[PDB]
């Protein structure tokens, strides 16, 4: 299952 | 055994259109099992292995919405980086993101990943400690500072130590029959004249899973040859893999050369040489 968050660049 | 769950994410901005092309592929080990593509008729998270079809529609609904949510974040991040670098909107750029977990035989986490690249060059990556970041120029330095300020590391560390490991365990149980197996290669040598006084010997390995394999050639009694023609290990399309290694030898001295084939499914290597018909 995928991560909930990606970094905000 | 060593096992990994990894997600590969690519966003490609389009000059003229507003929504980028967004692709996510999910892998357990070398076996792909989920996919999301922006440019589908209805962009959904879709099975790519039959054993993940054991998940109910709630799994597919949550994963479709999260994929869709990720695409909106990757649209914004692409716009942020446009300004960081002072670039124009009439050219295409890409943001790539890999993440996931390597677990060991006991099933405990060995390494977690969370790394990104802009235009195919290292941008920011999460360190092995899962607590600090590495930046690569002025722009990733800003991103890194943003992420330190919101403690992005502990949000990624949480994913990689918990759900990534637990989900990987569930998938290994659903797809145990195809994921927890070793298919050893089957191997042979072919013979192809290359010039008058010369001959090309090709050592084939076929039908093996997982993908990792090594082929060596040597002249008997001499150290291994680096002077070797290799291909990238390639998918057969049915879930196994293929590879060959070639060497050019003198006409008549073929039997003085030896191929070895190493693979996780081979307690000992295979040992082959050219065998005339």
């Amino acid at each position: 299952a995928q991560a909930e968050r990606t970094p905000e660049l | 055994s060593p096992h990994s769950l990894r997600y590969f994410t690519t966003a490609v901005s389009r000059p003229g259109l507003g929504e980028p092309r967004f692709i996510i592929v999910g892998y357990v080990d070398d076996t792909q099992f989920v996919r999301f593509d922006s440019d589908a008729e209805n962009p959904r998270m879709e099975p790519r292995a039959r054993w993940i079809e054991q998940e109910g529609p709630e799994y597919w609904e949550r994963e479709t919405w999260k994929a869709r949510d990720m695409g909106r974040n990757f649209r914004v991040n692409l716009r942020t980086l446009l300004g960081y670098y002072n670039q124009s909107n009439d050219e295409s750029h890409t943001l790539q993101w890999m993440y996931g977990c390597d677990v060991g035989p006991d099933g405990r986490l060995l390494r977690g990943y969370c790394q990104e690249a802009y235009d195919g060059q290292d941008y920011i990556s999460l360190n092995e400690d899962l607590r600090s970041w590495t930046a690569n120029d002025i722009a990733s330095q800003i991103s890194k500072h943003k992420s330190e300020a919101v403690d992005e590391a502990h949000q990624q560390r949480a994913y990689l130590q918990g759900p990534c490991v637990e989900w990987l365990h569930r998938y290994l149980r659903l797809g145990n029959e195809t994921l927890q197996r070793s298919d050893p290669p089957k191997a042979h040598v072919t013979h192809h004249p290359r010039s008058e006084d010369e001959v090309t010997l090709r050592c084939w390995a076929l039908g093996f899973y997982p993908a990792d394999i090594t082929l060596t050639w040597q002249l008997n009694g001499e150290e291994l040859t680096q002077d070797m023609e290799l291909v990238e290990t390639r998918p057969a399309g049915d879930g196994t893999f293929q590879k060959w290694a070639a060497v050019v030898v003198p006409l008549g001295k073929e039997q003085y050369y030896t191929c070895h084939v190493y693979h996780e499914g081979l307690p000992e290597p295979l040992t082959l040489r050219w065998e005339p018909p």
């Binding site: - | 590969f8 790519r48 295409s92 072919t190 291909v231 990238e232 390639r234 057969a236 399309g237 049915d238």
Partner: protein
Amino acid sequence: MIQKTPQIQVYSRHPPENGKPNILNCYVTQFHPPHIEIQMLKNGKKIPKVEMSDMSFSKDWSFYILAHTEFTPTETDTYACRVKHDSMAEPKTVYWDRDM
């Protein structure tokens, strides 16, 4: 963007025999940017129903993808993969070899 040029392999799923149906694979690896056009050809004509796998990428950020289609080798017919990519001035055609 450095621009990386595609490596193309054209190969059958199983060892070829004249008359026996089979799968023809075009594996394109280690290229950048990700935008690529892949066509599989029989006797220089476009094969219509060609399966395209999902674009992923390698540990160095380089892209890879698989095209494939059903085919029956015969001693006369000729098969190829043509690839267009920004790293290349011309589209590149790699012909199928019955001994790769």
